[PDB]
Amino acid sequence: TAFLWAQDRDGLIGKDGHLPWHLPDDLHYFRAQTVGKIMVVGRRTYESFPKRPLPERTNVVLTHQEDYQAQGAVVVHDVAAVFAYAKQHPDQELVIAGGAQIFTAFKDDVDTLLVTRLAGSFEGDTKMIPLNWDDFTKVSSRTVEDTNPALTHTYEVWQKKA
Numbered sequence: 001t002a003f004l005w006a007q008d009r010d011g012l013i014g015k016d017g018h019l020p021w022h023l024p025d026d027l028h029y030f031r032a033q034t035v036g037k038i039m040v041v042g043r044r045t046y047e048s049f050p051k052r053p054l055p056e057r058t059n060v061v062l063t064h065q066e067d068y069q070a071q072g073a074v075v076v077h078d079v080a081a082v083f084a085y086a087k088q089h090p091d092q093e094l095v096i097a098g099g100a101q102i103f104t105a106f107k108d109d110v111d112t113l114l115v116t117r118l119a120g121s122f123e124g125d126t127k128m129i130p131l132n133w134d135d136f137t138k139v140s141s142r143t144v145e146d147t148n149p150a151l152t153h154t155y156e157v158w159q160k161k162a
């Protein structure tokens with residue numbers, strides 16, 4: 001399983017349950033990556049989905065109550081069950097597009113970590129938590145140069161190391 005997330009250089013992920021900055025460029029990449037794979041997105045996150053719904057994709061909506069019905073994605077209230085499901089299908093890749101609470105709960109045990117850095121900065125009421133360098137290491141790093149300083153960003157991939 002792999003976790004994909006993006007955060008501002010200053011230390012911001014979003015605000016009012018929405019993305020203050022618009023980067024369709026990076027978003028297209030994320031959408032393409034999740035193609036042919038099962039991904040789980042938190043309900044609060046779903047509210048931020050700027051390009052919804054997401055047809056022709058195995059998306060699952062995460063909610064507190066199993067009884068609650070969600071459209072476009074399967075509703076599961078058991079965090080442990082999702083993990084076991086992925087374990088059952090090792091061949092299938094798992095990608096998580098939030099929410100932050102979900103990220104935190106599964107932050108301690110993640111096989112693949114995806115980190116996106118933004119050259120620009122945005123103001124918001126949500127700040128990203130501290131990252132343990134010892135817990136994870138970067139397998140490789142990629143540099144992307146855009147005309148606008150804010151547009152330019154660096155993409156890196158981290159994996160668990162013994």
Ligand SMILES: NC(=O)C1=CN([C@@H]2O[C@H](COP(=O)(O)OP(=O)(O)OC[C@H]3O[C@@H](n4cnc5c(N)ncnc54)[C@H](OP(=O)(O)O)[C@@H]3O)[C@@H](O)[C@H]2O)C=CC1
Pocket residue numbers: 004005006007013014015017018019042043044045046047048049062063064065076077078079097098099100101102103128
């Ligand atoms: N740095 C980053 O890349 C990330 C950024 N973000 C940003 O944050 C926003 C979402 O974060 P935030 O608003 O704090 O809320 P979350 O998206 O983290 O909220 C998660 C929701 O999932 C459901 N849920 C949580 N825990 C469980 C559980 N144990 N069992 C079942 N369902 C569960 C709940 O739904 P309910 O209570 O509504 O039924 C809960 O409100 C996104 O819209 C985005 O803007 C989100 C993820 C990652």
